[PDB]
TrEMBL record:
Gene3D superfamilies: 2.120.10.10, 2.60.120.200. Residues 413-612 form the Trans-sialidase C-terminal domain. This is Sialidase. One of its GO terms (cellular component) is cytoplasm. SUPFAM superfamilies: Concanavalin A-like lectins/glucanases, Sialidases. It comes from Trypanosoma rangeli. InterPro entries: ConA-like_dom_sf (IPR013320), Sialidase (IPR011040), Sialidase_fam (IPR026856), Sialidase_sf (IPR036278), Sialidase_trypan (IPR008377), TS_C (IPR055239).
Length: 628
């Protein structure tokens, strides 16, 4: 949906210049105080109690102003709420502030880490030293009661404890200045560790991220050895299949995502899955924004949810908040959860008792409220998509493939299967069976499990960089396998394209691909190498084509055997390639008026290089995988 979906709705929960908080005076008296702006939302579930956490920016929405940490909590899924100030600021000056709450729930405890500042008027990364700052950890305890039918809850907040004595003065060379949590909901790892992703500023103002974790429920804390590149901030972390996945804010460039299998000791950029997929605006050169990144189980399948504005207006406007759902292979855009063209901002998502919610910013004139959203239409779509993913994976994995010399052979590969183009299509769209990235079609006619091309630019474009802002097939620049069943229907005049990966840039360079020629020979394309002919094919005969690329090496297989010239380097330099799209047939909107008379069916895309057993299995099961 292009806006909050039919069936969903929201309320303004923390209302700018309206909702009050129980401000505690120095003398201990409480006064209901109006709050200019509420920012930096997090919503979590603590033993059945929704707890919403926010910066209460009392006087202005500016970062360096008088701020305290507010909490609203509900025992009836948002029907009613109680309000508190969980963490007070130091009251040292007119701009004293506790801000940027990062939260972990473990049992009936909430662990909140905030940055506390006394008097600075400038931005944290630019301070002369860390003398105005303390990282404060606060523990809240949620207690539920039951009085003749009615359930109520209380939350007690402990005294803040400064973690400044535990912050090293240096990291491998780097002289430290300050750190804050990554903002939003953090995690308890499967081993019980409290895991905060942190953002650290060095003396010069460079920012980078790290994991800070505790093995003893916050009694002690350790900074793990790994770190992000410089320029990463506001990290969000979740645990996936035994690894921490750290998703970073990157002002002015695409978002970096890292994985660590050893509690943050070693970080590896997620080039094969999520790194550089998301970004800060269509042109990637704008201020970025915080994102929520949470693992949940929907319809029996573990998935990750990610929120971020499209920010088409740029700077801090942060219009058009979207929610994506991924299983680390496919990436589905659930849609826009903010309304129309409104400015949004920081966000949080919660899945609780089979209902989905969001708490996020709305901004008019830099006065901010937080809306509490019931994502009813969105959850319905998510469940449908997860059912599609499970049904197709289970179907493929259950195919009885032919036995090979060494009941059934090996399973049709489903691990890392990202996209599949098969029977469903129309005149302009070839549908991804996995519902994420369709291919665009021209001059085509439907055939079982695919399309027959006839006319100028007859073919399909499966966009890679051409997806635009959110690059869900960015993994292909690091590795991929592309598979298809093909027939050549008419001889070409000279050479004509069939299947491949095109590159952005001058001319019409290809990374890896296959063409065919008037002599009935194949013409594999291995990067920039002169594409000489090899082998032999016949008109009207079906052939299986597999292109593999990993470790900068490319191979082209026909009928399960590599063509001459395979197995060499196809990308030179150290710079990742920038694939524009996969082409199927001879699509084009300009240049030579290519017209490849071929029929292509069952196009499969994987985010890894399939092994020999897998390639053979696909070659032997071509008549078995189609959607019909
Ligand atoms: C401590 C602090 O300043 N946090 C602020 C953060 C920060 O200024 C930026 O990441 C540059 O370091 O920015 C934003 C923001 O809406 O973009 C809100 C945070 O409250």
């Amino acid at each position: 949906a292009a806006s909050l979906a039919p069936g969903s709705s929201r309320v303004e929960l923390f209302k700018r210049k309206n909702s009050t908080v129980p401000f505690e005076e120095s003398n201990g008296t409480i006064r209901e105080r109006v709050v200019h702006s509420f920012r930096i939302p997090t919503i979590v579930n603590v033993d059945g109690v929704m707890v919403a956490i926010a910066d209460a920016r009392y006087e202005t929405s500016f970062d360096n102003s008088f701020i305290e940490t507010a909490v609203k909590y509900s025992v009836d899924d948002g029907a009613t709420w109680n309000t508190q100030i969980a963490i007070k600021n130091s009251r040292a000056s007119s701009v004293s502030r506790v801000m940027d709450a990062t939260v972990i729930v473990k049992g009936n405890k909430l662990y909140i880490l905030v940055g506390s500042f006394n008097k600075t008027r400038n931005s944290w990364t630019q301070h002369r030293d860390g003398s105005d700052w303390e990282p404060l950890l606060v523990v809240g305890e949620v207690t539920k009661s039951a009085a003749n039918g009615k359930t109520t809850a209380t939350i007690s907040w402990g005294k803040p404890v400064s973690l400044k004595p535990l912050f090293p003065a240096e990291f491998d060379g780097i002289l430290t200045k300050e750190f804050v949590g990554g903002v939003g909901a953090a995690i308890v790892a499967s081993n019980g560790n409290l895991v905060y992703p942190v953002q650290i500023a060095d003396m010069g103002g460079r920012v980078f991220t790290k994991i800070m974790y505790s093995e003893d429920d916050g009694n002690t804390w350790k900074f793990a050895e790994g770190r992000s590149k410089f320029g990463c901030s506001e990290p969000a972390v979740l645990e996936w299949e035994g690894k921490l996945i750290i998703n970073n804010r990157v002002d002015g460039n695409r978002r970096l995502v890292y994985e660590s299998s050893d509690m943050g000791k070693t970080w590896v950029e997620a080039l094969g899955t999520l790194s550089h997929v998301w970004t800060n605006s269509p042109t990637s050169n704008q201020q970025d924004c915080q994102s929520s990144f949470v693992a949940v189980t929907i319809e029996g399948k573990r998935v990750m949810l990610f929120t971020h504005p499209l920010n088409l207006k740029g700077r801090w406007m942060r219009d058009r908040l979207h929610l994506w759902m991924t299983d680390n292979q496919r990436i589905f855009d659930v849609g826009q959860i903010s309304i129309g063209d409104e400015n949004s901002g920081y966000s949080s998502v919660l899945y609780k008792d089979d209902k989905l919610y969001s708490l996020h910013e709305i901004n008019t004139n830099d006065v901010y409220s937080l809306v509490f959203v019931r994502l009813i239409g969105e959850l319905q779509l998510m469940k449908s998509v997860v059912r599609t993913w499970k049904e197709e994976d289970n179907h493929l994995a259950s195919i009885c493939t032919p036995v090979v010399p060494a009941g059934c052979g090996a399973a049709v590969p489903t691990a890392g299967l990202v996209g599949f183009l098969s029977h469903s299509a129309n005149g302009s769209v070839w549908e991804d069976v996995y519902r994420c990235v369709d291919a665009n079609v021209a001059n085509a006619e439907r055939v079982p499990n695919g399309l027959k091309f006839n006319g100028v630019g007859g073919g399909a474009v499966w966009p890679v960089a051409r997806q635009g802002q959110t690059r869900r097939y960015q993994f292909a620049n690091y590795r991929f396998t592309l598979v298809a069943t093909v027939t050549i229907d008419e001889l070409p005049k000279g050479t004509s394209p069939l299947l491949g990966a095109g590159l952005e840039g001058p001319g019409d360079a290809k990374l890896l691909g296959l063409s065919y020629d008037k002599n009935r020979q194949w013409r594999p394309l291995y990067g920039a190498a002169p594409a000489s002919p090899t082998g032999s094919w016949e008109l009207h005969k079906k052939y299986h084509v597999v292109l593999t690329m990993a470790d900068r090496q490319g191979s082209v297989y026909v009928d399960g055997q590599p063509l001459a010239g395979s197995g060499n380097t196809v990308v030179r330099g150290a710079t990742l390639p920038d694939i524009s799209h996969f082409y199927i047939g001879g699509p084009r909107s300009k240049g030579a008026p290519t017209d490849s008379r071929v029929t292509v069916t069952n196009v499969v895309l994987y985010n890894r290089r399939l092994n020999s057993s897998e390639i053979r299995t696909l070659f032997l099961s071509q008549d078995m995988i189609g959607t019909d």
